[PDB]
Amino acid sequence: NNHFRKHWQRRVRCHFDQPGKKVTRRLARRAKAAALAPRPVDKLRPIVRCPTVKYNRRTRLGRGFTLEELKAAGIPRLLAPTIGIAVDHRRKNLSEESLAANVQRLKDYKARLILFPRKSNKPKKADTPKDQQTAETTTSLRTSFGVEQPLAPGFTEISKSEIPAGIEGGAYRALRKARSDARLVGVREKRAKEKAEAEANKK
Amino acid sequence: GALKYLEELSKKKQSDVVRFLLRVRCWEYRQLNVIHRASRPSRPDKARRLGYKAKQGYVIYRVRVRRGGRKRPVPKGATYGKPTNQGVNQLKYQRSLRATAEERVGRRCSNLRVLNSYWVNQDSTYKYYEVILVDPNHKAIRRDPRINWICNPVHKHRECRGLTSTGKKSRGLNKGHRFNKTRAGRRKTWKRHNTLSLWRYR
Amino acid sequence: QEKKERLLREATAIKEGKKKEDVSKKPYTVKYGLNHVVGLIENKKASLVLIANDVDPIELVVFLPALCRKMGIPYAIIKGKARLGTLVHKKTAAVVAITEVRSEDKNELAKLISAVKEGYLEKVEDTRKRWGGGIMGFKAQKREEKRKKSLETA
Amino acid sequence: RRLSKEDASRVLEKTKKRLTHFPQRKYAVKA
Amino acid sequence: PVERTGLIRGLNKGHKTTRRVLKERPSRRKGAQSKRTQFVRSLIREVAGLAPYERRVIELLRNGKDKRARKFSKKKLGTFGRAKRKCEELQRIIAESRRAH
RNA sequence: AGGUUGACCUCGGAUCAGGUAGGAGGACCCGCUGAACUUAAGCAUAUCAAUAAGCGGAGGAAAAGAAACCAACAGGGAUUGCCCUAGUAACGGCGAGUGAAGCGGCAACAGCUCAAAUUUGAAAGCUGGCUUCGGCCCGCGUUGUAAUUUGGAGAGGAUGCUUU
RNA sequence: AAAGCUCCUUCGACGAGUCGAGUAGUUUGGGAAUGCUGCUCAAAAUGGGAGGUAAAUUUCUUCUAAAGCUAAAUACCGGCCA
Structure with missing residues (x-):
């Protein structure tokens, strides 16, 4: 399973510039943060x-x-x-x-959110007042507003009196019945329609 | 206004009035030169919806192109290689006759930019097209933000690179599963899929 | 020049604190422009429509008699888009429409509308449904007349 | 041959209205 | 919307949520008739008349050969659904002409 | 004066006023056109390869791009690129071989303009010329140049606060 | 003067030789499910496209083609500097 039957040497991409590209990306991130300060570097x-x-x-x-x-x-x-x-x-x-x-x-x-006025000498009522403009801020909304609970908790505890009774007949039988009903939804509808037509004909 | 009526009437190409107009205009355009300037669009609603404006700097050029397939210019119309199980009468050009018409009009007016084009007529020998062109050096064009994107040097000869509507159709630039090979550019996608990528810590 | 003088008067009225409608009266002009006139016909504001006979492309005005007949508007086909352009200070005009006139010309407008209805529309009521053209050339006409004469003689 | 700075900086009236009433604001987010 | 059963298989399967009713997006209005478009299409139909294949289908429908009309319309247009819609539209045209005459 | 005097339309001329294209470069980029050696025992499907050569066109990037998308979920949400999906689904004489995509993690993120509406109580728009820089003219244009609207909507109403 | 927010009886224009179909060549993993182009036919108004096995009937789900612009992350055996 070796796909080397084309002129593969013409299209070999090495990655010797991996640390240099990481340095370039970090420099660009620093420049973007300095240009955007005091706003966070990303969007909510x-x-x-x-x-x-x-x-x-x-x-x-x-x-x-x-x-x-x-x-x-x-x-x-x-x-x-x-x-x-x-x-x-x-x-x-x-x-x-x-x-x-x-x-x-x-x-x-x-x-x-702290909203600075468009003009400093003429604040509006939607704007944050100057006495409240000073506070410890965050610059990473992906960090401060991330996904806190990405999965459901895998383990909880309940009292032994709160154990559910379960589905009647068992979960395996419930799954088998659900699959059977889904497979026979059309046949039973056709049979019921034919029976209703026969009852209307010979009522 | 009247352009809604013109669009609805242009849908009915087999009606008596549209057939008569197509016949007389096909004769007239066959009498005229292969590429010639039109004073005004013959389909104003079609030109307006493709982007024409009645403004100094928009021009209309009419062009006829020979229709049918494509012939490989080999001596005596026969190849000297492995058998192909087909004749040169059945070769197909991968671009459209509309694209060929736009290329020839652009070469005729190399100072202008090709914006779009539309079908106006056809017969057994020719298909007839009208091409809208914009002058990037006219200041009425240059002052208008809706059109002065075309003054930038990256839009030089869009019809040659397939950046017009027929070019996008021919290059297959649409989203989804039917356009997997072409939507980002066919040769670029092929190069990406045929590049061997070797990392340092592999 | 008239618009500039009117705007000067309105600017002076604004300066002395009066509305522009205090010194400007309601205008009565010939309505023109194809989309404008088509919308006026659709909203039945137009009282009379004049359509130029030499519009190229003809598709711009080919539906206009049928539109005027469906909306009950009196229309007439007239010679000269240049003649209508002289009315509306342009080189050409495809169509013009009269919606309203002044009270000293209402009787003249009614008489012109009735004259159009009685002397153009009723006279072209049957000929407008007929096919045109089909005329032979001079030499073909003479050849066919000679052939019919020979067939009648023999 | 490049577009002049005035012509390159011209904007439509709708864009001008939107920029007049909703420009990019200066803001900070508390932690 | 019907509530899901909470199971992985069967009819109405899937995780239970409280489904909302959305106001319909304006992009889904496409295909609806409007007064201006109806008016313009009616006037243009009156001005322009019919296509020759439409006249052929109308003649077949007047002779009563409905299967002929459907087969010929499918050959002319390409698809069975378009042929069916065209045959219904031309039958409406024939009925309007008969009620006018 | 009407056998005249004109208005338009189309088509021409000018070493007319002001402009623009050509060629180079082509590593990378967008298209067109297009092999054979090779590999299949040989060999017209195939493979090499939708490659080399040939032709046209750009830029500092190009191209793509804000869904006529993916999906079938408790639904995601423009484009590009890396990792994975995956040598998998699938295609294939006499078999040599060929071969994606959705999801998922990341890098980077940014959104919009028209045509289809009558400004109709006022073409409100624009090229050029001359300017005393106040404007004034020759014109383009109603076969439609501004404002308004683009489906996420919008238009009409209603309503009371905010905005520059 | 322009602009935003909230509510509403109503109205709510949306790109055609185009989409699509057949056929031929080419192409693709899509030699039942791919794209492109040529020729012939040639649309519609809850319409149209897609939903990777052909068709009829009834549903459902997703978007809204046939006009257009746009930085970044990506490439770089050319040029310039290091």
Whole structure:
């Protein structure tokens, strides 16, 4: 299983520039942080659940918050990308739980936000006052607003009187019955339709 | 206004009025030169939706191209290699006749930029196209933020590099599973898939 | 020049603290521009429509008689887009429309509308549905006349 | 042949309105 | 939306959540008829008339050969669904002409 | 004066006023065109290879790019690149061989402009010339130049606070 | 003067020889499921595309093509400096 039948020597990529590229990336990050100070170096991201049945046990960071999440948090969609919040217009909220989690995330960020006035001599009422502008800040939203609990807890404890009775017949029999019903959903519907037609014909 | 009606009427290409207009205009454009300047677009709604404006610096050039397949210019139309099980009458050009028309109009007006083009007519011998061009040196163009992106040097000869609409279609730049080989660039994707990557700590 | 003088008067009125409508009256002008006139016909604001007979491409105005007939607007086909351009201070004009006139010309407008209805639309009511063209050349016409004469003689 | 700085910095009226009322703000986030 | 069963297999399977009702996205309005578009298409149909293959299908439908009309429309357009929609539209045109005459 | 005097449309001329392209370079980049040696016992499918050579076109990067996407989940969410997916799904004379993608971790992240609407109580737009730098003219343009809207919406209303 | 937020009876235009179909050549892992191009036919309005086995019927899920712009992370046997 050796794929060396093409002119492979023309397209060999070595990586001797790995430490140099790491140094260049760190220099670029330092320059971006110095240019963006006192703002954090990154944008606030929502918590999303990974697709497919393999990865839906785990949550991670998404692209941006939804318009519904911004509306429920009270943050206008034009103000949001100017105060460090990422916006994603494609994503929708199919269920209430993720919507509530991301709305609470936005409200925590809004409670921790310090908003400097556009003009120092003319502050507005949406702006943070000068007596509150001084506080210990964070510069990594991926760290301070990360995924705290990416998986469910793998172990809890309950009293022995709170042990559930379980599904009737057993979980194995419940799984077998669910698979059988899914396989026979159409045949039983056709049989019921034929029986109803026969009953209507010979009532 | 009237351009909605023009679009709905241009959909009906087999109606009597559109067939008559196509016939007389095909005769007239066959009488004219192979590449010639049009004073105004013959399909104003199509030109407007492709981006034409009635502004100093937008021009329309009409061009006819010979239709059909492509011939390999080998002596006597026959190859001297391994048998191909096909004739030169069945070779297909990977670009469109629209793209060939845009290239020839760009060479005719090398001072301008090709914005887009559209079909206007065809017969058995020729397909007929109208190409919209923009003058990047006209100050009415240069002052307009909707169009002055075309004044930058990276947009020199988009029709030659396949950056027009027909070029994007021919290069297959669409998202998804049907365009796996081409969506990032076919030769670039091939080079990425055929590069042997060796790390230091391997 | 008239617009500049009107804007000067309105600017003076604003300077002395009056609205521009205090010194500017309601205008009554010929409506022009193809999209503008088409929208006026669709909203039935146009009282009379004049369509130029020499529009190239003809698709711009080919639907306009049918639109005016569906919306009940009196129309007439007239000779000269340049003639309409002289009306609207342009080189050419594809279509013009009268929506409203002044009260001293309302009777003239009604008379012109009735004259158009009685002397153009009723006269072209049947000929507008007929096919045009199909005319032979001079030599072909003479050849066919000679052939018909020979067939009648023999 | 490069575009002049004024022509390169020209913006549309809608973009100008959006930049006038929602520019990039200075801000900090507490920890 | 129907509540999921909480199981990994079977009908209505999957993890239970409280499904919301979304206001419909404006990108999904495509295909809806509008008054202006209906008006313009009606006027353009009146001005331009019919295609020759449409006249052929109308003649077949007037003669009553519906299977002929569907087969010829599939040959002309390409797909069975487009042929069916075209045959229904031309039957509506024939019915409107009959109720007018 | 009307056998005249003009208005437009199309098409021309000028060493007319002001501009622009060509060639070089081509390591990398975007396309077109396109082999054979080789490997298959030989050999017209195949492989080498959608490679070399040939032709056109760019930049400091280029290209791609804000879903007519992936998915089938408790759903993700523009593009690019690395790691993995994976020598896997799949394709393949007489078999030599060929071979992706979604998810997942990371690097980096940024979003938008038109056409389809009547400003219609006022083409509100723009090239050029002359300027006393206040403007004034020749024009383009209604077969549509500004403002407004782009599907995440928007338009019309209602409503009361904020913004520059 | 312009702009944002909240609510609503209503309205809500959305790209055609294009999509798609057949056929031929080429290409692809997609020689049942790929893309491109030529010729012929040639659309629609909850329409249209996709949902990797052909078709009819009934559902469902996702987007919204046929116009356009855009930094970074990526490449670099050319040039310049180290």
